[PDB]
Amino acid sequence: ASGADALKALNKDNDDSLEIAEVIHAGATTFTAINPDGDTTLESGETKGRLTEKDWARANKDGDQTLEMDEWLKILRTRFKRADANKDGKLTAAELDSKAGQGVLVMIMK
Amino acid sequence: ASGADALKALNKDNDDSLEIAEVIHAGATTFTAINPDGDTTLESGETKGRLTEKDWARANKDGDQTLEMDEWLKILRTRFKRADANKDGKLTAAELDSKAGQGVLVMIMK
Ligand SMILES: [La+3]
Ligand SMILES: [La+3]
Ligand SMILES: [La+3]
Ligand SMILES: [La+3]
Ligand SMILES: [La+3]
Ligand SMILES: [La+3]
Ligand code: NA
Ligand code: NA
């Protein structure tokens, strides 16, 4: 999806950017949206096309084979900061359209 | 609540302990449940009896006045490790009955 697409679906506060509260919340809903087996965790087979193998290495450090909500969202907040080019806490459509911004979108839109 | 109370209410996998996947899930459910004003965040007035001001200082470092899902769960995972006395990844009723374990329960039981 484009940055304009993401703003159409997720932005509700009469601006033209996504902030950390909007991004984390959408990331939490997407966590549930991509979990179809009825448990409470994400496995490597459920994150294909959204997380890489190295993403699991930097987030999953408790020794298990499961991604909990906080581990999932920690990757998201890091991608948020990587896409925040001018570091103002807001992600415009142009910032969401960057290669780093696209990494945010795959975690907040199913 | 006591450790035995928490296991009866929250433990579903036929053991005698709460693991990190079960704790994070109940903490995520509690986050939404104790948020009555219709937004997606927790404010300081909504975490009374569960978090202290120093908890906000160590978790809320993005400069706002709101606690997002990942900031809330980050406090919880730290409390989990503080309560995991033998560091085996499981919280028994006895560990949930300690001072550190009660800090876990106030974040996973509304
Ligand atoms: La906004
Ligand atoms: La799953
Ligand atoms: La994990
Ligand atoms: La258990
Ligand atoms: La609130
Ligand atoms: La915050
Ligand atoms: Na920005
Ligand atoms: Na333990």
**CB contact at 8 A, A20 and B64:** yes
- From chain A, pick out residues whose CB is under 8 angstroms from the CB of B68: 20-21, 24-25, 73
Helix (H) or strand (E) holding A9: helix A3-10
Chain-chain contact of A64 with B20 (C-beta, under 8 angstroms) = yes
A34 touching B (Cβ < 8 Å): no
Count up the domains in chain B and report the number. 1
For residues A15 and A7, give the distance between their C-alpha atoms in angstroms, rounded to a whole number.
9
DSSP H helices, chain B, are 3-10, 20-33, 53-59, 69-83, 93-97, 99-108
Give contacts of B 59-98 with A, CB under 8 A.
62-64, 66, 68-70, 73-74, 76-77, 89
Token representation of residue A4:
């304009």
Token representation of residue A67:
């991604």
User: What 8-state DSSP symbol labels residue B7?
Assistant: H
Strands B18-19, A91-92: parallel, antiparallel or unpaired by DSSP? unpaired
In three-state secondary structure terms, A90 is coil
Query: A77 C-alpha to center of ligand 3: Å?
Result: 17
Q: Most B CBs within 10 Å: which of A68, A91, A107, as the mutation test of the B interface?
A: A68
For residues A25 and A10, give the distance between their C-alpha atoms in angstroms, rounded to a whole number.
10
Chain-chain contact of A73 with B76 (C-beta, under 8 angstroms) = no
For residues A106 and A1, give the distance between their C-alpha atoms in angstroms, rounded to a whole number.
8
Candidate from B66, B74, B89 with C-beta closest to A21: B66
For residues A9 and A23, give the distance between their C-alpha atoms in angstroms, rounded to a whole number.
12
DSSP string, B43-61: -GGG-TTT--HHHHHHH--
Beta bridge partners of B41: none
Domain that holds residue A5: 1-110
Candidate from A40, A62, A89 with C-beta closest to B25: A40
In three-state secondary structure terms, B110 is coil
Q: How was this structure determined?
A: X-ray
